[PDB]
């Protein structure tokens, strides 16, 4: 690893600088280096890891959707034949995206999840595992699409079971997990009713627990609740 010679603390410091500079590829490489030091991650460090890779894969997903749309239009009746280039370049971006997902899943499997014992870390990492299998599922078309989807489902479900046992209904990690699992149901699993039910129950149980929160926690929780509500408005 090219970050093997850099101090753990220096990698974290530079990941924060890269975030300020909107250099998310650098940020992700710095945080990968920090994970590979072998120590567990603090809450702030887990969030740096997540922000870095979410921005990297987000750019790849947006590009893949543009190119896939062009490719699908090229295959409609009346469309002029343009040769292999659209497919080739969509495949190039797709392969790079799969590489980033495999990198994140590899960090989770070696060895972030197995060392994560507290609910906040374990739920965070299992949600991340669900998310990056979900991104693999968005582009999957072959023999393994069903297995990729089930891997995402399984990780989200384990995270859900822990979060319901160990976290209050307003906990932002729990809320963000439920949000993303509801997106999985709607966009990946062809289960819009499950998506709507999950989002509604999550919203309502959080609403009833807001009275326990400080002003700052109330702001954290309601920001995510608003995304649940936005989706319910889109879906119903």
């Amino acid at each position: 690893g090219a970050m093997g010679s850099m101090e753990r603390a220096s990698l974290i410091q530079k990941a924060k600088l890269a975030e300020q500079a909107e250099r998310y590829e650098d940020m992700a490489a710095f945080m990968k280096g920090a994970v590979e030091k072998g120590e567990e991650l603090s809450c702030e460090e887990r969030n740096l890891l997540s922000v870095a890779y979410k921005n990297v894969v987000g750019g790849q997903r947006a590009a893949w959707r543009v190119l896939s749309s062009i490719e699908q239009k090229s295959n409609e009746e009346g469309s002029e034949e343009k040769g292999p280039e659209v497919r080739e370049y969509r495949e190039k971006v797709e392969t790079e995206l799969q590489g980033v997902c495999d990198t994140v899943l590899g960090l989770l499997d070696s060895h972030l999840i197995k060392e994560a014992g507290d609910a906040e870390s374990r739920v965070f990492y299992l949600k991340m595992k669900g998310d990056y299998y979900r991104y693999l599922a968005e582009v999957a078309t072959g023999d393994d699409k069903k297995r990729i989807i089930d891997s995402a489902r399984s990780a989200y479900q384990e995270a859900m079971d822990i979060s319901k046992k160990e976290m209050p209904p307003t906990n932002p990690i729990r809320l963000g997990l439920a949000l993303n699992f509801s997106v999985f149901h709607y966009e990946i699993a062809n289960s819009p009713e499950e998506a709507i039910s999950l989002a509604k129950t999550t919203f309502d149980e959080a609403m009833a627990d807001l009275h326990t929160l400080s002003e700052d926690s109330y702001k954290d929780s309601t920001l995510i609740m608003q995304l649940l509500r936005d989706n319910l408005t889109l879906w119903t």
């Binding site: 997540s50 922000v51 921005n55 997106v183 966009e187 995304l227 879906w235």
Partner: peptide, 10 residues
């Protein structure tokens, strides 16, 4: 039909 919103990077 825009895509459902997942958790943004905060």
């Amino acid at each position: 039909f825009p895509q459902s919103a997942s958790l943004p990077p905060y």
